[PDB]
Design a protein around this ligand. Structure first.
Ligand SMILES: Cc1cc2nc3c(=O)[nH]c(=O)nc-3n(C[C@H](O)[C@H](O)[C@H](O)COP(=O)(O)O)c2cc1C
Ligand SMILES: O=Cc1ccc(O)cc1
Length: 383
C-alpha cells in the first residue's frame, strides 16, 4: 500500500504520472478524470513512435525489446514501425494477450497548457536513456538521434522529455549518455529541437546528475570525483569495490562543491534554452544525486544539508530556485519518485518518506502562491 495521491492535496498545479500505464488503460481512464493529471508512457513509446494514435483509437501495440534498450544500434531505436507500417509487413503478432481501449474521449486528449507550450493531448513522453551518445564528448547521436525524436514527435502538440542529460562532466559517469554543457553537444541538440518543433511538438530537457550511480572508474579516468551526499553509505557492493579499485572513493560534497553543481545546473539550463528548448526538468528522482540528498538512508550528513526533512530537501529546492531565477518558472519542472527504491533508495519502507516529499510539494506550492509556479511536477508511480 502506498499512493502518490497525497501530492494533489498539496501541489495545485499540473502533475505528470508515469509507470505501467500502457497496458492498463482502465487505470488511466480513472486517473485522467482529474483535470490536471498527465500520463507518461515509457517503454511502449520506445516500441511505438505513433503511440498517441494507438491510444486514441485503441490500437494494438508493438512489443519492446529490452536487449536493444541501451545498445549502440539503429535496431530497436529507429526501426520500430507505426501501426500503418506494421500492417504492411504483416502483424505476425503484436503484444500478446492484451485488450486495447480507446481513450480519445477522455481528458487524455483535451488540450492543456504546460509552461509556454499549448499541449493538444496529455500523453507525455517521459525521459528515456538510450545510451547512444558518442564517446568521447557525450555527444548526441549524429546518425539516428534526430530521426528517433522525429518519429515520436509524430502527433502534433506532443510534450517530449528528453533522455537524461549531464549538466557537466562531474555530473556524468556514463560514456554513452548525452551531455548538455558543451558547444558540439548544443549543435546536435539544436537539430533535435528543430525537428521536434517542425512537427508542432515540444521538447523538455531533463537535467541529469548521477551521484553515486556514476561509474567510479569512468570518473577516475577523467580525473573527476565520485561524489554523493555522504561517504559512509554506498549504493551497493559493486560500487564500493569499483571506488576503492580505481582509488576514487565516494566523496561527501562540501558546500562549495554543492554551489558548483548549482552553477552547472544554471549554465546547462541556459544552454538548453539558447539551443531552442521549451524548458527543463530537474531530475530529482530514481536514486541520483538530488534524490541521494532527499533520502535519509543515503544522507547521513550533520550539516545544513542533512539531519532533517527541511535540510534534506535544501539541495533540490536550491536548484529549483536557481533555475527559476535563471530562465523563469514557466520553463522549469521537477521529477520525483517517493516510493522508488531504484539505485538504493528507501521507498515505502521508510515510514517518514511521504513526509519528506510532502514537504517538497509544500515548498513548491509556497513558491507557486508567491507568484513562481513551476510548469509541472513529474511523479514516478509505485510498483
Ligand atoms: C530504458 C529506460 C530508460 C529510462 N531512462 C530514464 C531517464 O533517463 N530519466 C528518468 O527520469 N527516467 C527514465 N526512465 C523511466 C521512465 O521515465 C518511466 O518512468 C519508466 O519507463 C516507467 O514507465 P512505463 O511503465 O511506461 O515504462 C527510463 C525507463 C526505461 C525503461
Ligand atoms: O532516471 C532514471 C533512469 C532509469 C533507467 C535508466 O536506464 C536511466 C535512468
Amino acid at each position: 500500500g502506498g499512493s502518490n495521491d497525497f501530492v494533489y492535496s498539496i501541489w495545485k498545479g499540473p502533475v505528470i504520472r508515469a509507470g505501467n500505464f500502457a497496458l492498463h488503460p482502465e487505470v488511466v481512464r480513472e486517473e485522467v478524470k482529474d483535470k490536471r493529471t498527465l500520463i507518461g508512457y515509457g517503454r511502449f513509446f520506445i516500441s511505438n513512435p505513433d503511440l498517441v494514435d494507438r491510444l486514441e483509437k485503441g490500437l494494438p501495440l508493438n512489443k519492446y525489446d529490452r536487449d536493444t534498450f541501451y545498445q549502440m544500434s539503429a535496431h530497436g531505436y529507429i526501426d520500430y514501425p507505426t501501426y500503418e507500417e506494421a500492417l504492411k509487413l504483416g502483424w505476425s503478432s503484436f503484444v500478446k494477450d492484451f485488450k486495447p481501449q480507446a481513450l480519445g474521449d477522455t481528458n487524455l486528449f483535451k488540450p492543456i497548457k504546460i509552461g509556454n507550450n499549448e499541449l493538444l493531448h496529455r500523453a507525455v513522453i517521459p525521459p528515456l536513456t538510450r545510451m547512444r551518445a558518442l564517446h568521447p564528448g557525450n555527444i548526441p547521436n549524429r546518425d539516428w538521434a534526430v530521426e528517433y525524436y522525429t518519429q515520436r514527435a509524430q502527433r502534433p502538440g506532443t510534450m517530449i522529455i528528453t533522455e537524461g542529460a549531464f549538466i557537466s562532466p562531474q555530473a556524468g559517469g556514463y560514456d554513452n549518455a548525452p551531455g548538455v554543457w558543451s558547444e558540439e553537444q548544443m549543435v546536435e541538440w539544436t537539430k533535435i529541437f528543430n525537428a521536434i518543433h517542425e512537427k508542432k511538438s515540444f521538447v523538455w530537457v531533463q537535467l541529469w546528475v548521477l551521484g553515486w550511480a556514476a561509474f567510479p572508474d569512468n570518473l577516475a579516468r577523467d580525473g573527476l570525483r565520485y561524489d554523493s551526499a555522504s561517504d559512509n553509505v554506498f549504493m551497493d557492493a559493486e560500487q564500493e569495490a569499483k571506488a576503492k579499485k580505481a582509488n576514487n572513493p565516494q566523496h561527501s560534497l562540501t558546500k562549495d562543491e554543492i554551489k558548483q553543481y548549482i552553477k552547472e545546473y544554471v549554465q546547462a539550463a541556459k544552454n538548453s534554452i539558447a539551443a531552442g528548448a521549451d524548458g527543463v526538468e530537474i531530475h530529482s528522482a530514481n536514486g541520483y544525486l538530488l534524490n541521494q540528498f532527499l533520502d535519509p538512508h543515503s544522507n547521513t550528513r550533520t550539516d545544513e544539508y542533512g539531519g532533517s526533512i527541511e535540510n534534506r530537501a535544501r539541495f533540490t529546492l536550491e536548484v529549483v530556485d536557481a533555475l527559476v531565477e535563471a530562465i523563469g518558472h514557466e520553463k522549469v519542472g521537477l521529477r520525483l519518485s517517493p516510493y522508488g527504491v531504484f539505485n538504493s533508495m528507501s521507498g515505502g519502507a521508510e515510514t517518514g518518506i511521504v513526509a519528506q516529499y510532502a514537504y517538497v510539494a509544500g515548498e513548491l506550492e509556497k513558491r507557486a502562491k508567491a507568484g513562481k509556479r513551476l510548469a509541472f511536477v513529474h511523479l514516478v508511480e509505485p510498483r
